[PDB]
């Protein structure tokens, strides 16, 4: 969804404001390879003439067996306004944004492009020592602050105010503390270019009067500049942002330079493993890591009971199981993070299982399991367990002096989606809460 | 396979091993040596034919389907489906 | 030939244009065939 | 959809250039054609961030990686660009530069042959290379040849072309040919794009070359199913005869060495394998056709 | 089976492409003046409608006879 999300949030922003985004050649550069194979076809071919070409003729192009995959090309493209249909003469003309025409044609026959891409001081640092070493830091550091484990430095009041008027780490004064949410824990599962997009996307959001535009623009050009090399310094409102990049660990600054990092370059859709463990019958957990970062987030749910220089071993218990279902997280979600750090072993036992399966009678073939079944119906039977009360905020209606009033009442309520229960025999029903007041409304209309 | 094969012994395969089995099948493809004393040298006529593309559906001399494109026989004009084939009707390979 | 007239006059040019068509090569390949005996027999005849 | 590599073989050469400014009036159209390849090499890295690109020249003395430079600078290209762009642009032109410098040394070494065959089959190479040593990348070939110098001898050509079409075929790995010069067709070129899923295109003026490799070459492996190519011209593939020369049709070839012959070698033996043919069995097919008496 | 440039001009015209990539290199000239660009267009999709019919019909096919 990281094409998804940035392509949808360029939709929703006004055509008048995409003109003025389109003005820097860097960022046409990060816009067009977001879009799909055949719209960046269709674009490289307009670009170089200044022309106008008939609808019908890039439908030619397309095979009839490729004729869907055209329908998606064209809607996207039109949505973000790179395309402007022209109709006159009889005919649906095509024509090119000439701001995207320009931005582009320069970037790649290498035009004046008002330091777009940023200048060069020939002052360049050790990427392995540093660069990886701040950013992974920092960037760690606010992950551990968000899963709740404690750490010493926490992050500053910038990212989080983000945070907190965010989905994510929902917090409450009177409790005094974070948690994580449902989606907090689906921000963790997702991988680290997905992850870095989902607080970068909600600070664009966040930010009031500071241009969106300007946001963009820095954003966009950040990922075109290369890890290790010096970058002099710009926009006025992109000072501020620049000083504010360091909070995410994404640009390092000594205290006139900024050096981009590897999450820097990892922004613009950049293309045994750590966090595996193994999940067996007796509830033992041994997940062969050996990073705070995995251990922490493997406590949300996982009873830990000591820990080696090479991995980390623990149990599931009904305890650990409870505490991250009340926080929010889903038991769907924890056997995924689960399948997807499971051990090469696992996969290998499981396939044998599946081959002799095969063999007994290959007329079936069921999704294969790396795990034993019996920890997801362990898992998804406590789930149960804490949705057993299920219970609705309302009120209650009875005494009706006619039978045609009450089934009136009633069925206005089905037709608004506000009725929850209802009795024939008793002449009774309850409503939601929320939509107590409608009930309400129409009884007296 | 000796008496078959001019005395030659290694012709008669046996596998040790499954892998040892696809080797022996690929072992196979490649055309196989030629005996001195066996002299079958001569001249075989075959064509080169030209590929059509036509607008409408054509019956095939091959079998009497309806195909939409195929290659002209040099010889006779008759198309054939797929090569490389013996024409049905010159008998040209 | 007499197959293309009796689909001409029963169906009135509908069909006949279509079934020359499909029986065309054949036709162009039996037409050859005779005109090939034809010219051979002129030279080795006389 | 998945990162491509592009392999552009451009066959490079005085002689090949040199000849088809004299037919025209344009002077220095190499530059021309060296100003495209840069700006369609650029358009390729702009279509995805992890594709890569590999150009190879065929000068006439032999052939040489213009990029990726070899482990064993001058300002030719503005440094206000994009860098991976400029990382690329600049190592092509600056070995064009060193490549030129070595030719013109060797101006008075006697080109006997083109090179054509070894590029082609060493960009082969370097396809091969590249999907091994990284792990699920598509991969294309672009030729640029000079058709406008008159050749000495193509049958050589014929037999390296057509094994690397077998090689590409297996790959996966479509070929295009961008010809420019005075002959429309060639009939060993433009049998390769045909066979290996490839585009053929012929241009008679360098001046806007770009249009056609940016409209025409620019399909990406990704893609290739769902875009009809824009070749104009029909392949026959035949061969030309061993001693005649001409295209065969209807011929016979050798049982032994699969050699073409239009007409029945002088000597009833084979010109190729010096392989005798029976009396008796050729005497079949001078035999007339039956006509009655 | 259906004029020669002698060596000193090679050597010429290798100098002025040697000279014209040394001096100054432009990309941007390789845009079309647009007088061009609808010519080179106009010839490519005369291709891409007769290959666009040709490949629209690449068992047994449906047939209109009865
Ligand atoms: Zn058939
Ligand atoms: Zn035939
Ligand atoms: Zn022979």
């Given at each position: ?445 | ?42 001249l075989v006529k075959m064509g080169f034919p030209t590929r059509i593309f036509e607008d409408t559906p054509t019956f095939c001399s091959c079998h009497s389907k309806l195909v939409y494109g195929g290659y002209f026989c040099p010889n006779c004009h008759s198309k054939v489906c797929s090569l490389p084939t013996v024409c049905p009707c010159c008998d040209l390979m | ?20 068509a499909y029986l065309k090569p054949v036709l162009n390949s039996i037409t050859l065939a005779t005109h090939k ?10 | ?157 014929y037999?390296?072309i057509m094994?690397?079409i077998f090689?590409?075929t ?15 067709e060639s009939t060993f070129?433009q049998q390769t794009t045909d066979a290996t899923n490839?585009?053929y ?30 070749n104009h011209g029909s392949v026959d593939f035949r061969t030309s005869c061993y001693?005649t020369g001409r295209v065969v049709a209807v011929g016979f070839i050798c049982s032994?060495?699969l050699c073409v012959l239009s007409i ?21 097919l001078?035999?007339?056709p039956?006509?009655?008496? | 089976?259906t ?48 290959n666009?019919?040709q490949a629209?019909h690449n068992?047994?096919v ?5």
């Amino acid at each position: 969804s990281l094409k998804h999300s940035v392509t949808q949030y360029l939709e929703e922003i006004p055509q008048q404001v995409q003109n003025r985004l389109y003005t820097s050649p860097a960022t046409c550069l990060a816009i067009y390879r977001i879009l799909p194979p055949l719209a960046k076809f269709f674009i490289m071919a307009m670009v170089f003439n200044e022309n106008e070409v008939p609808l019908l003729d890039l439908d030619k192009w397309v095979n009839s067996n490729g004729k869907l995959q055209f329908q998606n090309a064209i809607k996207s493209m039109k949505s973000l306004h790179l395309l402007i249909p022209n109709k006159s003469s009889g005919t649906l003309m095509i024509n090119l944004n000439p701001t995207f025409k320009i931005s582009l044609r320069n970037a790649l026959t290498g035009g004046e492009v008002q330091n777009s891409f940023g200048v060069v001081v020939e002052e360049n640092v050790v990427s392995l020592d540093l660069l990886d070493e701040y950013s992974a830091n920092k960037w760690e550091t606010i992950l551990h602050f968000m899963v709740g484990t404690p750490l010493a430095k926490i992050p500053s009041e910038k990212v989080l105010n983000l945070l907190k008027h965010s989905k994510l780490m929902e917090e409450v004064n009177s409790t005094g503390e974070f948690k994580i949410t449902n989606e907090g824990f689906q921000f963790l599962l997702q991988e680290i270019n997905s992850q870095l997009w989902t607080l970068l996307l909600q600070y664009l959001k966040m930010i009031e009067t500071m241009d969106l535009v300007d946001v963009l623009h820095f954003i966009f050009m950040l990922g075109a500049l290369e890890v290790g090399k010096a970058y002099k310094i710009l926009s006025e409102t992109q000072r501020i942002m620049l000083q504010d990049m360091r909070d995410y660990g994404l640009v390092f600054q000594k205290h006139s330079i900024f050096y981009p990092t590897k999450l820097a370059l990892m922004l613009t859709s950049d293309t045994i493993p750590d966090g595996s463990l193994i999940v067996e019958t007796n509830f033992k957990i041994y997940s062969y890591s050996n990073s705070p970062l995995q251990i922490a987030v493997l406590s949300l749910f996982v009873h830990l009971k000591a820990r080696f220089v090479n991995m980390v071993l623990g149990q599931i218990t009904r305890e650990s199981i409870r505490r991250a279902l009340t926080n929010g997280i889903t038991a769907d979600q924890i056997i995924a993070y689960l399948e997807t750090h499971a051990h090469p072993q696992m996969r290998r036992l499981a396939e044998e299982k599946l081959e002799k399966k095969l063999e007994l009678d290959p007329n079936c073939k069921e999704p294969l399991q790396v795990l034993p079944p019996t920890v997801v119906d362990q898992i998804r039977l406590w789930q149960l367990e804490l949705d057993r009360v299920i219970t609705y905020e309302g009120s209650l209606y009875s005494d009706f002096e006619t039978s045609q009033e009450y089934n009136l009442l009633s069925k206005y309520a089905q037709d608004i989606g506000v009725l929850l229960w209802k009795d024939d025999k008793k002449k009774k029903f309850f409503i939601s809460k929320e939509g107590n007041s409608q009930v309400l409304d129409f009884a007296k209309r | 396979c000796k008496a078959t094969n001019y005395g030659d012994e290694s012709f008669y395969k046996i596998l040790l091993d499954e892998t040892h089995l696809k080797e022996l099948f690929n072992e196979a493809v490649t055309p196989l040596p030629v005996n001195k004393i066996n002299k079958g040298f001569t001249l075989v006529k075959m064509g080169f034919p030209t590929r059509i593309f036509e607008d409408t559906p054509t019956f095939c001399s091959c079998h009497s389907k309806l195909v939409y494109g195929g290659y002209f026989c040099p010889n006779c004009h008759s198309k054939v489906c797929s090569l490389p084939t013996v024409c049905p009707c010159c008998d040209l390979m | 030939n007499e197959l293309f007239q009796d689909v001409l006059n029963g169906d009135g040019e509908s069909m006949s244009n279509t079934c020359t068509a499909y029986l065309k090569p054949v036709l162009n390949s039996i037409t050859l065939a005779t005109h090939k005996y034809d010219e051979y027999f002129n030279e080795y005849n006389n | 959809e998945s990162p491509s590599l592009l392999t552009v073989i451009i066959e490079i050469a005085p002689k090949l250039w040199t000849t088809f400014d004299e037919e025209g009036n344009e002077k220095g159209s190499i530059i021309k054609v060296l100003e495209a390849l840069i700006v369609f090499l650029n358009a390729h890295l702009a279509f995805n961030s992890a594709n890569k690109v590999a150009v190879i020249a065929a000068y006439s003395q032999g052939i040489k990686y213009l990029y990726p430079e070899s482990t064993s600078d001058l300002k030719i290209i503005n440094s206000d660009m994009y860098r991976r762009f400029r990382n690329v642009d600049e190592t092509l032109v600056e070995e064009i530069y060193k490549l030129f410098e070595l030719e013109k040394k060797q101006i008075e070494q006697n080109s006997q042959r083109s090179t054509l065959a070894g590029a082609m089959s060493a960009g082969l190479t370097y396809v091969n290379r590249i999907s091994k040593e990284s792990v699920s990348l598509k991969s294309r070939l672009l030729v640029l040849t000079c058709g406008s110098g008159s050749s000495k001898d193509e049958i050589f050509q014929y037999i390296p072309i057509m094994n690397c079409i077998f090689s590409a075929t297996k790959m996966k790995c479509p070929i295009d040919v961008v010809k420019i010069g005075g002959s429309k067709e060639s009939t060993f070129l433009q049998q390769t794009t045909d066979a290996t899923n490839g585009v053929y295109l012929h241009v008679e003026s360098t001046e806007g070359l770009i249009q056609y490799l940016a409209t025409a070459m620019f399909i990406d492996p990704s893609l290739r199913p769902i875009i009809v190519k824009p070749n104009h011209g029909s392949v026959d593939f035949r061969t030309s005869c061993y001693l005649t020369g001409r295209v065969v049709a209807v011929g016979f070839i050798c049982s032994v060495c699969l050699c073409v012959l239009s007409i029945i070698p002088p000597g009833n033996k084979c010109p190729a394998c010096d392989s005798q043919f029976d009396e008796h069995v050729i005497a079949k097919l001078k035999r007339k056709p039956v006509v009655p008496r | 089976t259906t004029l020669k440039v002698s060596n000193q001009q090679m050597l010429q015209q290798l100098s002025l492409v040697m000279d014209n990539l040394i001096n100054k290199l432009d990309l941007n000239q390789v845009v079309p003046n647009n007088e061009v660009s609808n010519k080179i267009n106009k010839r490519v999709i005369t291709a891409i409608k007769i290959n666009a019919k040709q490949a629209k019909h690449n068992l047994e096919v449906k047939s209109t006879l009865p």
